[PDB]
């Protein structure tokens, strides 16, 4: 068998066949981990649904882990995609394992686009879907005590920027941050060694960063703004606690431990992790590559103990 093919059959293996003489095929096509070949964790129930705010509808999707009981602990999830793509279907695979494994339910926000929408609209769209589904913890049967918000690259630079936010504006109150390989921004008159570094070869590169934030930005003063550069914030005081992921071959991978660093300097618990032999946006490669299915199994590990 072909490297790369005897590992992702072990990978998509892994779960037993589900009992097809009784298989919907909605259900099928919801779960299906053919194409691409991204294996879909089992979770007891996912629920779309509208979010209406606003100026704007907000669709949402909702994981509930199978074992679970309530109050539930939950987890606002905003997607990576550098501001510009991803969706609901693409961070799906990432939602599961997050629920299932991390044991808590879990909310994937489909929050706008640049350049359709440039920045602040994700930042937004972050605050108020974290408010909306906080303010109907009863109705999602959550624990109130226990809703942390997270999210990978630009949906990490989410996160962390909806919890000063919260801070701000006083609530909702958020009990934790996971924030995986996070683009919490740093000041580009001391760009961090992996910034330089990492720059070519590893998925993400420094031409697409820059093309990213055109589409995202409106003029240049916004890169150290806070809401698009967190790390610069000056009160980082008060936050919920952290954990932060970083992937060694990632030019991002400073930026992730810059953040720690302003939060720890704040007075806020914080861990950072950096994966060895990963890039950047990982979480992509689950069931496909063994090194990223570890760490993002991990990474969901370390939610579970958060909200315990």
Known sequence: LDPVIQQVLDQLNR???????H???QQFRSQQSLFPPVKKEPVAEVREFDMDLPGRTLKVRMYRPEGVEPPYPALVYYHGGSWVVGDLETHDPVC???AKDGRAVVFSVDYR?????????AVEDAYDALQWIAERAADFHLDPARIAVGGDSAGGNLAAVTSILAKER???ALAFQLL??????????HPPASIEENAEGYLLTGGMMLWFRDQYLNSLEEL?????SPVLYPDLSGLPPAYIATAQYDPLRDVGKLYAEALNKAGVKVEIENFEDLIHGFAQFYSLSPGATKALVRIAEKLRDALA
């Open 15 to 21: 779960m037993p066949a589900p009992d097809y003489k």
């Open 224 to 228: 150290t703004h806070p809401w698009f």
């Open 113 to 121: 686009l640049a350049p359709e929408h440039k920045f602040p609209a």
């Open 180 to 189: 995986i390989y996070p683009s919490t921004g740093y000041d580009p008159a």
């Open 96 to 98: 599961r394992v997050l």
């Open 170 to 172: 006083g609530g909702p």
């Open 23 to 25: 298989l919907s095929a």
